[PDB]
Design an enzyme around this catalytic site. Structure first.
Site, PDB file in Angstrom:
ATOM      1  N   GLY A  37      17.703   5.901  10.529  1.00  0.00           N
ATOM      2  CA  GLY A  37      18.367   5.892   8.923  1.00  0.00           C
ATOM      3  C   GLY A  37      17.489   5.876   7.842  1.00  0.00           C
ATOM      4  O   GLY A  37      16.377   5.888   8.507  1.00  0.00           O
ATOM      5  N   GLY A  42      16.704   4.113   0.798  1.00  0.00           N
ATOM      6  CA  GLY A  42      16.210   3.576   1.540  1.00  0.00           C
ATOM      7  C   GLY A  42      16.291   4.064   3.021  1.00  0.00           C
ATOM      8  O   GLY A  42      16.325   4.938   3.285  1.00  0.00           O
ATOM      9  N   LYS A  59      18.014  -2.386   7.720  1.00  0.00           N
ATOM     10  CA  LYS A  59      18.751  -1.757   5.986  1.00  0.00           C
ATOM     11  C   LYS A  59      17.512  -1.983   5.654  1.00  0.00           C
ATOM     12  O   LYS A  59      17.638  -3.273   4.731  1.00  0.00           O
ATOM     13  CB  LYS A  59      19.735  -1.428   5.737  1.00  0.00           C
ATOM     14  CG  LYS A  59      19.701  -0.644   4.487  1.00  0.00           C
ATOM     15  CD  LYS A  59      21.562  -0.683   4.309  1.00  0.00           C
ATOM     16  CE  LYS A  59      22.164  -0.354   3.055  1.00  0.00           C
ATOM     17  NZ  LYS A  59      23.214   0.341   2.864  1.00  0.00           N
ATOM     18  N   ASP A 151      33.808   4.320   1.727  1.00  0.00           N
ATOM     19  CA  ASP A 151      32.276   5.040   2.527  1.00  0.00           C
ATOM     20  C   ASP A 151      33.569   5.107   4.255  1.00  0.00           C
ATOM     21  O   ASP A 151      32.299   5.399   4.863  1.00  0.00           O
ATOM     22  CB  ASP A 151      31.359   5.167   2.144  1.00  0.00           C
ATOM     23  CG  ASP A 151      30.668   6.281   2.219  1.00  0.00           C
ATOM     24  OD1 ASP A 151      30.967   7.480   3.099  1.00  0.00           O
ATOM     25  OD2 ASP A 151      29.611   6.146   2.592  1.00  0.00           O
TER      26      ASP A 151
HETATM   27  C1  O9L Z   1      22.559   3.879   6.477  1.00  0.00           C
HETATM   28  C2  O9L Z   1      23.311   3.118   4.950  1.00  0.00           C
HETATM   29  N1  O9L Z   1      23.512   1.537   5.467  1.00  0.00           N
HETATM   30  C3  O9L Z   1      24.148   0.772   6.540  1.00  0.00           C
HETATM   31  C4  O9L Z   1      23.571   1.694   7.772  1.00  0.00           C
HETATM   32  C5  O9L Z   1      23.541   0.809   9.170  1.00  0.00           C
HETATM   33  N2  O9L Z   1      24.164  -0.040   9.065  1.00  0.00           N
HETATM   34  C6  O9L Z   1      23.974  -0.174  10.774  1.00  0.00           C
HETATM   35  C7  O9L Z   1      24.086  -0.779  11.477  1.00  0.00           C
HETATM   36  C8  O9L Z   1      23.691  -1.350  12.340  1.00  0.00           C
HETATM   37  C9  O9L Z   1      23.407   0.220  13.362  1.00  0.00           C
HETATM   38  N3  O9L Z   1      23.309   0.233  14.584  1.00  0.00           N
HETATM   39  C10 O9L Z   1      23.014   0.947  15.057  1.00  0.00           C
HETATM   40  C11 O9L Z   1      22.418   1.828  14.039  1.00  0.00           C
HETATM   41  N4  O9L Z   1      22.042   3.058  14.946  1.00  0.00           N
HETATM   42  C12 O9L Z   1      21.661   3.714  16.340  1.00  0.00           C
HETATM   43  C13 O9L Z   1      23.091   4.014  16.589  1.00  0.00           C
HETATM   44  S1  O9L Z   1      23.161   5.812  16.191  1.00  0.00           S
HETATM   45  C14 O9L Z   1      23.369   5.626  14.647  1.00  0.00           C
HETATM   46  C15 O9L Z   1      22.178   4.345  14.017  1.00  0.00           C
HETATM   47  N5  O9L Z   1      22.081   2.170  12.536  1.00  0.00           N
HETATM   48  C16 O9L Z   1      23.253   1.404  12.225  1.00  0.00           C
HETATM   49  C17 O9L Z   1      23.694   0.856  10.570  1.00  0.00           C
HETATM   50  O1  O9L Z   1      22.851   2.250   9.849  1.00  0.00           O
HETATM   51  C18 O9L Z   1      22.853   2.709   7.520  1.00  0.00           C
END
Ligand code: O9L
Ligand code: O9L
EC number: 2.7.11.26
Lengths: 351, 351
Positions: A37, A42, A59, A151
């Site tokens: 992500g 960031g 993150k 959000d």
């Molecule tokens: C952007 C902004 N603020 C938070 C986030 C974020 N927090 C988490 C926690 C846990 C997570 N666990 C997995 C995950 N992936 C794999 C599965 S499909 C999405 C990406 N993604 C996660 C995640 O992304 C992303």
């Protein structure tokens, strides 16, 4: 501390504060690092904890040394089965980064919905009930602290496909709402954005999250977003095309200090005819009680949990389609019930 | 100064600096004020100039007294038939707002495409040629100043449906690119975001705009976005699903200091099978020369204007479908041709 272990794998060792529990920094090692992500803040990484073999999401956000991080503050307070757990936080590299180490969850509601939508099918309603119910639980929990996510959208609903467990994620927009203290209007992913925000309200409440949850429910029933705006204000056109033009009373309920949008008078579309013919009426009825213009007229998260749409989840006989037990649904704490304790009689079935 | 006219209308009078011409503030009066847009920056209004009756768009952005505004600086330099004209700027109400008064343009390419897509039709190719040609012209113009828009997308292509005249708008992301001086990676609307930005490049060039223009062309041919990412990095998956996995050479060309995405090897999809069967080959061929991974391999805007896909526009006989003449297409200045002057022999037909 970056090293190589037995075979030749890249191990990163950091000093991290436990997410919840005592403020006691400890060495944490992880490997198998990859970007999953990114955003204004960031990057998000997948990694594997060396000790336990468990997958985490890290993150990584740019940190103003002098400015305190709002997201970290909120994540340290939260401990709930339907919110992704902050395991650790640590700082890294003439600028400093906060790293939030979270439980890894392998799917999102968005991806599961897209699989169905791309095949012009809908998610079976049982999945809808399980996801929507757990989201309303997470919302009851954070709203009980005055914390608003701001959000709610399918991408921020993580799920374990096997257990059907949902975790709310991305508290980067989240805020403790205080009576009197203005909040930013441009907030929330457009499709899920409550009408009061589009009217430029700075005095909104945690109920903007229930509107978003309504938009998610509707999307899961329809197989596409219910309000697909091309812009912030075209978002309002799309809403009006279903709810009709709001009254002067409703507009005042949304923002008592608003300016002229001067859009044309459109009559409401009947709720039942928005959704495909066999859509269960309890689902449509819950939608109507979530997507109200007047923010105070929207069901609370706890009330939404008590709606007849979720009746099936309170059947002693209910199981996941894969045959396994339903996850924890009825282990409500005091804090969860704090908004209306007597709702327990409905929310906790007999046995 | 807010007053009432002969009839009883709400007239607003402000002191505004002409957009182009001498730094000489003058009284400007306008009425019929309404919100047509909003964003992180603030609000966009429609209004009517009292003297001339002309419709303007007023973009209102919060201004840091200490910070000089990048957008205003750029808009004051620009004078081109396919960029929305800054008519005036003024300041308004303990915080101060910059107001950019712009020519009002009553449609966007995005809305015109949506009308067709919502009816499961495609925009006739002549409209595609007219829109894409004028966009490439506006890009040749701004790129000749080292100015990069960095948010090229169908919503930022205004058009007069009657004359088919296109104006590039929203210079809120725009920047004069200087060799050596880092630029932010998270930039551009996701679907239009060049692969180098997703690889976190901070030393990209004006060629990120050509990638965006390619994404707009593809979308106009397909009736939907070619790369619909659910996130910043899923955007890269979607790109790879069409272009295939980039070579290590291409990755180095995009960001020579990049980190592990560790994505699977996917083979390229044949270009012609991305588009519907009757898609003109010159359109697909132009698309292939825009959506190159290696930024330097992408056609320049002026080169794109000279592509055979636009040959029809240089036909002495060509007219708009409504029967009216084609707008000014061939009145290239010296500045416009500066990237490759000899292209004039193609770009300016004898007639
Ligand atoms: C952007 C902004 N603020 C938070 C986030 C974020 N927090 C988490 C926690 C846990 C997570 N666990 C997995 C995950 N992936 C794999 C599965 S499909 C999405 C990406 N993604 C996660 C995640 O992304 C992303
Ligand atoms: C967001 C961020 N920065 C700039 C803008 C913007 N600049 C203009 C100029 C002229 C415009 N003229 C008309 C117009 N509408 C009416 C037609 S449909 C889109 C909104 N919108 C305009 C506009 O919007 C928007």
């Amino acid at each position: 501390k970056v090293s190589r272990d037995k075979d030749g794998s890249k191990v990163t060792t950091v000093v991290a504060t436990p997410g919840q529990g005592p403020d006691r920094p400890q060495e944490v090692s992880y490997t198998d690092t990859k970007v999953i992500g990114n955003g204004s803040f960031g990057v998000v990484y997948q990694a594997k904890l060396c000790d336990s073999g468990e997958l985490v999401a890290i993150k990584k956000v740019l940190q103003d040394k002098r400015f305190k991080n709002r997201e970290l503050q909120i994540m340290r307070k939260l401990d709930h089965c339907n919110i992704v757990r902050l395991r650790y936080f640590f700082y890294s590299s003439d600028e400093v980064y906060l790293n939030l180490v979270l439980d890894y969850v392998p799917e999102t509601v968005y991806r599961v919905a897209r699989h169905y939508s791309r095949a012009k099918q809908t998610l079976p309603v049982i999945y809808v009930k399980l996801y929507m119910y757990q989201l309303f639980r997470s919302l009851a929990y954070i709203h009980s602290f005055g914390i608003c996510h701001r959000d709610i959208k399918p991408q921020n609903l993580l799920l374990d496909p096997d257990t059907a467990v949902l975790k709310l994620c991305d508290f980067g927009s989240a805020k403790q709402l205080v009576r009197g203290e203005p909040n930013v209007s441009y907030i929330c992913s457009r499709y899920y954005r409550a009408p009061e925000l589009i009217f430029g309200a700075t005095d909104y409440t945690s109920s903007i999250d229930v509107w978003s949850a309504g938009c998610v429910l509707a999307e899961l029933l329809l197989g596409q977003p219910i309000f697909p705006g091309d812009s912030g204000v075209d978002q309002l056109v799309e809403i009006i095309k279903v709810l009709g033009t709001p009254t002067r009373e409703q507009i005042r309920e949304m923002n008592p200090n608003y300016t002229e949008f001067k859009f044309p008078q459109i009559k409401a579309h009947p709720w039942t005819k928005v959704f495909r013919p066999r859509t269960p009426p309890e689902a449509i009825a819950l939608c109507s009680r979530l997507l109200e213009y007047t923010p105070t007229a929207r069901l609370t998260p706890l009330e939404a949990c008590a709606h007849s749409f979720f009746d099936e989840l309170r059947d002693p006989n209910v199981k996941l389609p894969n045959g396994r037990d339903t996850p924890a649904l009825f282990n409500f704490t005091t804090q969860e019930l704090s908004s209306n304790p007597p709702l327990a009689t409905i929310l906790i079935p007999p046995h």
